[PDB]
Amino acid sequence: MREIVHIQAGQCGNQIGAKFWEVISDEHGIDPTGSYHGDSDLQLERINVYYNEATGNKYVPRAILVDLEPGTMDSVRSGPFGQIFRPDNFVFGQSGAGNNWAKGHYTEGAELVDSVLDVVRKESESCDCLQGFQLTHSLGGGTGSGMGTLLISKIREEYPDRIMNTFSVMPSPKVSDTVVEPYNATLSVHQLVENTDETYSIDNEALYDICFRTLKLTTPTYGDLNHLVSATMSGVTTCLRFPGQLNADLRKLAVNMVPFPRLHFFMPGFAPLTSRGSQQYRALTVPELTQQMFDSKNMMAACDPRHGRYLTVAAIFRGRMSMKEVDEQMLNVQNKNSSYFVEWIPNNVKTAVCDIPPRGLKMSATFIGNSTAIQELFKRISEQFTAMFRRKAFLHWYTGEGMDEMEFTEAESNMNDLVSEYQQYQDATADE
Amino acid sequence: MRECISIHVGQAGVQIGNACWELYCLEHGIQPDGQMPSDDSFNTFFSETGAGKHVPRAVFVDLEPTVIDEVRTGTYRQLFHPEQLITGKEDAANNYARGHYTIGKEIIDLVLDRIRKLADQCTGLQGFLVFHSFGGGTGSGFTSLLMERLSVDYGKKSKLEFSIYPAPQVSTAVVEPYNSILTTHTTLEHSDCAFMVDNEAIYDICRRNLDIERPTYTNLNRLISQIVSSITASLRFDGALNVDLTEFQTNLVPYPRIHFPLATYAPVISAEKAYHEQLSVAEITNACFEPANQMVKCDPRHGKYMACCLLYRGDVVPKDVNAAIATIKTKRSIQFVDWCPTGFKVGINYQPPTVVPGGDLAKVQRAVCMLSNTTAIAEAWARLDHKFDLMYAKRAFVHWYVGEGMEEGEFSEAREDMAALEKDYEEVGVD
Amino acid sequence: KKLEAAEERRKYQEAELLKHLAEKREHEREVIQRAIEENNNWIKMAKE
Ligand SMILES: Nc1nc2c(ncn2[C@@H]2O[C@H](COP(=O)(O)OP(=O)(O)OP(=O)(O)O)[C@@H](O)[C@H]2O)c(=O)[nH]1
Ligand SMILES: Nc1nc2c(ncn2[C@@H]2O[C@H](COP(=O)(O)OP(=O)(O)O)[C@@H](O)[C@H]2O)c(=O)[nH]1
Ligand SMILES: [Mg+2]
Numbered sequence A: 001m002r003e004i005v006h007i008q009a010g011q012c013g014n015q016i017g018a019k020f021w022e023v024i025s026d027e028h029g030i031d032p033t034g035s036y037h038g039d040s041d042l043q044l045e046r047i048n049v050y051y052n053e054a055t056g057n058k059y060v061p062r063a064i065l066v067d068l069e070p071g072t073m074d075s076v077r078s079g080p081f082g083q084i085f086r087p088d089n090f091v092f093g094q095s096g097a098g099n100n101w102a103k104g105h106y107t108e109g110a111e112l113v114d115s116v117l118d119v120v121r122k123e124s125e126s127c128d129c130l131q132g133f134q135l136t137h138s139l140g141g142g143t144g145s146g147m148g149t150l151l152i153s154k155i156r157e158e159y160p161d162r163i164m165n166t167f168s169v170m171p172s173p174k175v176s177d178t179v180v181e182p183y184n185a186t187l188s189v190h191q192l193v194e195n196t197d198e199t200y201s202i203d204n205e206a207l208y209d210i211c212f213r214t215l216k217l218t219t220p221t222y223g224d225l226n227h228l229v230s231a232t233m234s235g236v237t238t239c240l241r242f243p244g245q246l247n248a249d250l251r252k253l254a255v256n257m258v259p260f261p262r263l264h265f266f267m268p269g270f271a272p273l274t275s276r277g278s279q280q281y282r283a284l285t286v287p288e289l290t291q292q293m294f295d296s297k298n299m300m301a302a303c304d305p306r307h308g309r310y311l312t313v314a315a316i317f318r319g320r321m322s323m324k325e326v327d328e329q330m331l332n333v334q335n336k337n338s339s340y341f342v343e344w345i346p347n348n349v350k351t352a353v354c355d356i357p358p359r360g361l362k363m364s365a366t367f368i369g370n371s372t373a374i375q376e377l378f379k380r381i382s383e384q385f386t387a388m389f390r391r392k393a394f395l396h397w398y399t400g401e402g403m404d405e406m407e408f409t410e411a412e413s414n415m416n417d418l419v420s421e422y423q424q425y426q427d428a429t430a431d432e
Numbered sequence B: 001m002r003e004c005i006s007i008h009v010g011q012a013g014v015q016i017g018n019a020c021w022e023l024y025c026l027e028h029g030i031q032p033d034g035q036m037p038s039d040d041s042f043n044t045f046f047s048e049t050g051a052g053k054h055v056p057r058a059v060f061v062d063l064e065p066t067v068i069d070e071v072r073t074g075t076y077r078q079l080f081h082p083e084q085l086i087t088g089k090e091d092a093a094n095n096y097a098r099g100h101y102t103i104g105k106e107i108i109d110l111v112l113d114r115i116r117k118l119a120d121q122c123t124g125l126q127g128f129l130v131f132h133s134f135g136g137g138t139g140s141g142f143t144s145l146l147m148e149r150l151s152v153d154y155g156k157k158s159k160l161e162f163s164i165y166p167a168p169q170v171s172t173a174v175v176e177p178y179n180s181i182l183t184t185h186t187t188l189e190h191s192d193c194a195f196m197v198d199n200e201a202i203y204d205i206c207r208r209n210l211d212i213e214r215p216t217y218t219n220l221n222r223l224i225s226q227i228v229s230s231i232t233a234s235l236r237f238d239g240a241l242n243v244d245l246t247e248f249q250t251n252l253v254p255y256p257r258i259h260f261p262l263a264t265y266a267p268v269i270s271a272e273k274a275y276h277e278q279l280s281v282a283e284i285t286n287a288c289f290e291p292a293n294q295m296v297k298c299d300p301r302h303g304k305y306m307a308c309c310l311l312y313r314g315d316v317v318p319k320d321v322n323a324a325i326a327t328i329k330t331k332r333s334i335q336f337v338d339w340c341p342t343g344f345k346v347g348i349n350y351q352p353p354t355v356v357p358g359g360d361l362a363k364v365q366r367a368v369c370m371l372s373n374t375t376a377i378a379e380a381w382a383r384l385d386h387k388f389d390l391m392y393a394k395r396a397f398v399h400w401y402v403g404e405g406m407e408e409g410e411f412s413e414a415r416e417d418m419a420a421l422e423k424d425y426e427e428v429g430v431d
Numbered sequence C: 001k002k003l004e005a006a007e008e009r010r011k012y013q014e015a016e017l018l019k020h021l022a023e024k025r026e027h028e029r030e031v032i033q034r035a036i037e038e039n040n041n042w043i044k045m046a047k048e
Helices: A011-026 A070-077 A101-105 A108-126 A143-158 A181-197 A204-214 A220-240 A252-257 A284-289 A321-335 A372-389 A405-427 B010-028 B066-071 B096-102 B104-119 B137-153 B178-189 B199-208 B216-236 B246-253 B282-288 B318-331 B375-392 B400-401 B409-431 C006-022 C024-047
Strands: A003-009 A050-055 A060-061 A063-069 A089-093 A131-136 A165-171 A199-202 A263-273 A310-318 A349-354 A363-371 B004-009 B047-048 B054-056 B058-062 B085-087 B127-133 B160-163 B193-198 B262-266 B306-316 B345-349 B368-374
Touching: A003 A011, A003 A108, A003 A143, A011 A070, A011 A131, A011 A143, A011 A165, A011 A220, A050 A199, A060 B104, A063 A070, A063 A108, A063 A143, A070 A089, A089 A108, A101 A108, A101 A143, A108 A143, A131 A143, A131 A252, A143 A165, A143 A181, A143 C024, A165 A204, A165 A220, A165 A252, A181 A372, A199 A204, A199 A220, A199 A252, A199 A372, A220 A252, A220 A263, A220 A310, A220 A363, A252 A310, A252 B047, A252 B096, A263 A372, A284 A321, A284 A363, A321 A349, A321 B409, A349 B047, A363 A372, A372 A405, B004 B104, B004 B137, B010 B054, B010 B058, B010 B127, B010 B137, B010 B160, B010 B216, B058 B066, B058 B104, B058 B137, B066 B085, B066 B137, B085 B104, B096 B104, B096 B137, B096 B178, B096 B400, B104 B137, B104 B160, B104 B375, B127 B137, B137 B160, B137 B178, B160 B246, B178 B375, B178 B409, B193 B216, B193 B246, B193 B375, B199 B216, B199 B246, B216 B262, B216 B306, B216 B345, B216 B368, B246 B306, B262 B282, B262 B375, B282 B318, B282 B368, B306 B318, B318 B345, B375 B409, B400 B409, C006 C024
Parallel strands: A003 A063, A003 A131, A063 A089, A131 A165, A165 A199, A199 A263, A310 A349, B004 B058, B004 B127, B058 B085, B127 B160, B160 B193, B306 B345
Antiparallel strands: A050 A060, A263 A363, A310 A363, B047 B054, B262 B368, B306 B368
């Protein structure tokens, strides 16, 4: 287990993916040319998980950039770290998906899919020991959503034994670019339930609420939302890219986090919450960092963790702090909040501490929870879907692509079963 | 000549192996390059090359290369020949099924070929010492696979284990109870004697006795190595008790399945402490009957003894020992089973305990390791079995094992065997 | 026996995923061909 192959699909996927690469390059001391200029051996110890070493001192992201639209790709190349990417790894179409899952999954996407697989095969065959794949995409669009899930299925076919991981961004009416987002999301959730091993549920509803309510940003931009996404992505991948004992690879993370195959949707959390401009800040102790685990205000999925129960939790502390203090504080939270952890999975909270804090902060905490409360996110999508589907509104955009009504009914039913499954384990007891 | 082959499986096994071999070298005066400027018994554990270099009779195995890569870059890189440090590419991902079946099946033949090459250098091979964790996929899965194959290739050859019983303070997987029960069931019929080391007991000794706020594997292993050295000192030096591997079994194992002795070590003293009075034989003997010095957390006062071995090391006189045992009997019940005599088998090995320079342990003139077969050890199995039951009732995480080709029936079989083992400890203590 | 057992048990479930995944390729080709046949026939209509 070594290399992770990263895929970026659609507008959102490429925007969030590009930010992930500039954040992690900065943490690993890599400049936009690919040269390491850091001053810590920890930065290079597990550099091979995300970077290929090219001739000389240069490091190249093992990243494939995908879109059915060319514009986003140009914006990435023009960017700060745009030059770091492998030129041959940009795979783009000319005919977009027009925020239509059917175009991304069946028409335009199907036409481009083989060109993408050719690039993923090149990266995969170069690997000493491929862990698997990491996909960043939105569920509300057409490319990220439809083509992204098509790619997952095509990759799963060729690499059935590798770990399939995603960072899936959930649509919200609060920051919506299309009226059909509930359809695109439901059709994609159906695909993810079946085809991924782990999915980080990144909710735009929660990101907007954090920016507006907590960061006091009257009109949040994608730039503001993406600052929270990149902080979360950096946090959840800490264990994979730095030397550590816990969840050091994609499979060990999945084995510790996924008790039942379909229940692989994670609720990420982050503390402290910061705004792009906020380079202040003077705060955050160990008890303070720990308290934000149950804090709904710090969740990247718009669910209250106190409305459910944690099946499994992974908590990552970053910065210079006492491991003794972390262990005490973490035990206190489990003992005080006993009722929000399932009794039939003993020692289900695993903690890791990394000496390297993320940029701008001296101390941070990242939470990865497998909570039954994630059903609130799926319920929200199902109700938005049904409001439209009941009247067959905008259905012509999908049937016009060759889709049948049954696929819509099936996707919805599968998502409602997922909700019902979370509820089942929420109500389960250690009567054993 | 009576050679012993040491096998170190997975991260725990390899890391404990590093601590053991470092200590053996200090005890026998072997430098990290295998050179020694020199009783002769050390030859049971170290072979000799044409260049006068001393090489451990050991195999280090891991399914991932990281841990062993540290041995082959480290201080003792010249001590071992490259062929005895075996690594795969893909680990068992804390999954017994991956370690035993999927991944293990690829490297098994290579590991046995290396073991065979070491055995070919032996004139009187006694058997094997197997070091592994219960919790990891390699430590659990690969060990049981290897143990089965060793029984086939080395017909009625002694196999002893040093098993790392899992602790939540240092646990890396939620599935450790599953891996622990699966490995215990499969290995039970293949092991002659197994010494469990509870990571919590070791963690607590480091915290309490060595004043280490947050003990690391380095701290834990140094302490573990001292107990392993106490058990193996009479094989590596011209000892009187536990002189051969068959003698461990004879002295401590009354029934094939009840082969899990409890180790208790004393004294464990901090190095960064003010000069203090050396402990007497009475003081160190008293410390053996204190649950705080145990290697496994359990209550012997709630159990019954079936065998007790006291292994003294250093400046110790028989008169001092007998006086100490006599006073203990006057104050303590020390209850034995009906069919066993109330007694001790005592051994004195003249070499005082050696400690790693710059280590956490203080140098002492005399130390003692008590190996007792008590029914109280069943408490450790019960704790593990209960955690297994909690998850298994919901089939939580079971899909990971089934996906690797394991059958759900193997989980039921393993758990029923553990229930029979708990029942055996109960039946043995009856009268 | 109790190992090639795992080996063979491994394969049924991979072959199975490949079926569950050849079935997912089926649909796509059907729904893309159906996405032409219909447009092919709207003009078959339109001309006459
Ligand atoms: N005492 C001690 N315990 C250890 C050490 N390393 C790991 N462990 C324990 O062993 C268990 C984890 O298993 P590992 O040995 O790390 O894993 P592995 O055998 O390499 O197997 P895989 O990584 O899954 O292939 C946990 O209970 C750890 O606390 C060590 O150096 N010393
Ligand atoms: N967080 C975030 N969401 C975005 C971004 N760009 C678009 N979205 C969201 O993604 C969905 C629209 O999909 P998009 O990725 O633009 O379409 P695609 O190009 O066809 O994949 C909606 O839910 C948008 O709110 C971005 O940069 N950040
Ligand atoms: Mg390991």
